[PDB]
Design a protein around this ligand. Sequence first.
Ligand SMILES: [Mg+2]
Ligand SMILES: [Mg+2]
Ligand SMILES: [Mg+2]
Ligand SMILES: [Mg+2]
Ligand SMILES: [Mg+2]
Ligand SMILES: [Mg+2]
Ligand SMILES: [Mg+2]
Ligand SMILES: [Mg+2]
Ligand SMILES: [Mg+2]
Ligand SMILES: [Mg+2]
Ligand SMILES: [Mg+2]
Ligand SMILES: [Mg+2]
Ligand SMILES: [Mg+2]
Ligand SMILES: [Mg+2]
Ligand SMILES: [Mg+2]
Ligand SMILES: [Mg+2]
Ligand SMILES: [Mg+2]
Ligand SMILES: [Mg+2]
Ligand SMILES: [Mg+2]
Ligand SMILES: [Mg+2]
Ligand SMILES: [Mg+2]
Ligand SMILES: [Mg+2]
Ligand SMILES: [Mg+2]
Ligand SMILES: [Mg+2]
Ligand SMILES: [Mg+2]
Ligand SMILES: [Mg+2]
Ligand SMILES: [Mg+2]
Ligand SMILES: [Mg+2]
Ligand SMILES: [Mg+2]
Ligand SMILES: [Mg+2]
Ligand SMILES: [Mg+2]
Ligand SMILES: [Mg+2]
Ligand SMILES: [Mg+2]
Ligand SMILES: [Mg+2]
Lengths: 87, 101, 70, 116
Amino acid sequence: PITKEEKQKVIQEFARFPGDTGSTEVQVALLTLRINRLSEHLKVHKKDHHSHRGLLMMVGQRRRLLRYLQREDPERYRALIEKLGIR
Amino acid sequence: MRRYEVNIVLNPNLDQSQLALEKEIIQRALENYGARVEKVEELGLRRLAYPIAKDPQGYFLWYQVEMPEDRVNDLARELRIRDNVRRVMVVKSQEPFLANA
Amino acid sequence: KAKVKATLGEFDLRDYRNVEVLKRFLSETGKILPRRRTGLSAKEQRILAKTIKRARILGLLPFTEKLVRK
Amino acid sequence: KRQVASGRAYIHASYNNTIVTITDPDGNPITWSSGGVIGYKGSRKGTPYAAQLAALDAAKKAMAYGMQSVDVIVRGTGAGREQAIRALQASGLQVKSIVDDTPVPHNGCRPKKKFR
RNA sequence: UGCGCAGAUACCGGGAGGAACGCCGAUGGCGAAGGCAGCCACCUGGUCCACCCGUGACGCUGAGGCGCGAAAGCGUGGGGAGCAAACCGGAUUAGAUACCCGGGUAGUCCACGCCCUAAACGAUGCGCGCUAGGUCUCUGGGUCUCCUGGGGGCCGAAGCUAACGCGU
Ligand SMILES: [Mg+2]
Ligand SMILES: [Mg+2]
Ligand SMILES: [Mg+2]
Ligand SMILES: [Mg+2]
Ligand SMILES: [Mg+2]
Ligand SMILES: [Mg+2]
Ligand SMILES: [Mg+2]
Ligand SMILES: [Mg+2]
Ligand SMILES: [Mg+2]
Ligand SMILES: [Mg+2]
Ligand SMILES: [Mg+2]
Ligand SMILES: [Mg+2]
Ligand SMILES: [Mg+2]
Ligand SMILES: [Mg+2]
Ligand SMILES: [Mg+2]
Ligand SMILES: [Mg+2]
Ligand SMILES: [Mg+2]
Ligand SMILES: [Mg+2]
Ligand SMILES: [Mg+2]
Ligand SMILES: [Mg+2]
Ligand SMILES: [Mg+2]
Ligand SMILES: [Mg+2]
Ligand SMILES: [Mg+2]
Ligand SMILES: [Mg+2]
Ligand SMILES: [Mg+2]
Ligand SMILES: [Mg+2]
Ligand SMILES: [Mg+2]
Ligand SMILES: [Mg+2]
Ligand SMILES: [Mg+2]
Ligand SMILES: [Mg+2]
Ligand SMILES: [Mg+2]
Ligand SMILES: [Mg+2]
Ligand SMILES: [Mg+2]
Ligand SMILES: [Mg+2]
């Protein structure tokens, strides 16, 4: 799955300051981690639709957070995008 | 890794040569699959509740291991290959849920 | 009639290898006794079912028996 | 011509018939009777009377082979399943034990429309 | 009708193969719906509770679109035990193109691709806020006769309804 080790590695990579766990950046990072885990899981297991729902919703939430960061401070949006390689 | 329990039931007719053979065969398989053995319980001769392979008894082995998860299934395959090995069941270890405590 | 949990000690509901205790939860036949007769909780029965089935695959507890009566 | 003197008596009891087999302790049969073996032909075969007379015919056929001790196995439900046992007891055969081994599936095979 | 002297049925032993999981089993659980019951392991989605830690309105709905979608049915290749449309018989009957009985092909199962319906039902769209309680239950937490969340039920305040009824 996704152990707390990998998790904290990601949170700590994207934290806007130490002790930050709820940044929009940290959020879209974590989201995109599970997104890629799920998509790789769905390259095989194509016939598993009930998880595929999970993925649709995840991309939804990711795009809402990104659409927020775009509106508020676009510079950090471009930094995040360029760091994760999205869009 | 995770920590599992390997139950193995084999034919209760083996002399010392064959039993030592099947057992060190299980050792070798576990080595090849990367299983660190934390403890072992050799129960041995036990009357089965029903005939298995027409044999009314079974020789019981219980292992507690820690090993890579993605290698569990393959491991079980490798175990069931032996003729003398009759039951293979690997279970993920669990906390001993008490009742009537 | 007394219930099984009532007349029993502190036992591990998850241990599939303990036949001496599990055999207390089967009927005359190999069936699993309802919670009305076992005195277990919803969760407790849910766990017992699985551990009994695991033990049945090991040849430790039977799948079914024969009724000696009638 | 065998002299088993002890064995098994199987009561197969359906709603359309009751038939009795009598075997040695290893399961191999000796003699048997049924609802049609005695005179009855139609629905009258599944009656408990026919169960009695079938049981007794088979028990007398067991006497000549020397049967005294008998273990009774019972498969099925139906009229005269009990009546066949009660006939088996007063048959002069000492009944060692009685078991119900009626085969029930674990929901494996789809039954006929009649049974759903 | 059918099967049985080429020895069936009933019984014991060995073997093959397909399908479905008895008891647990619930008035129970999970899921967005369709739906999901042997067991083990792997991958994997949702959801709930406690802490009050982080972001700072990022929210709700949602025409189009896209994905899912019981059964039946369609295509190719498998498979094929039991059941079983069509169909072949036997009965019943005024007739029997049926209910009942003996058979039996598709199909029911697998893979991959179609099809997109339904009493697809809670015949009750989604989200939030407010409005007595009592009782049964599933599952968390707690200073654990109880208190406090989240589901599933039954009575019922205020109120609503044509009425039946609905009623945190
Ligand atoms: Mg083997
Ligand atoms: Mg008859
Ligand atoms: Mg009755
Ligand atoms: Mg039915
Ligand atoms: Mg003939
Ligand atoms: Mg003929
Ligand atoms: Mg012929
Ligand atoms: Mg047989
Ligand atoms: Mg087989
Ligand atoms: Mg075949
Ligand atoms: Mg049930
Ligand atoms: Mg705060
Ligand atoms: Mg602030
Ligand atoms: Mg929505
Ligand atoms: Mg739409
Ligand atoms: Mg469909
Ligand atoms: Mg279908
Ligand atoms: Mg087809
Ligand atoms: Mg075909
Ligand atoms: Mg048929
Ligand atoms: Mg038919
Ligand atoms: Mg006809
Ligand atoms: Mg006619
Ligand atoms: Mg008429
Ligand atoms: Mg429905
Ligand atoms: Mg409305
Ligand atoms: Mg929503
Ligand atoms: Mg309530
Ligand atoms: Mg508590
Ligand atoms: Mg629900
Ligand atoms: Mg409630
Ligand atoms: Mg009123
Ligand atoms: Mg009401
Ligand atoms: Mg409120």
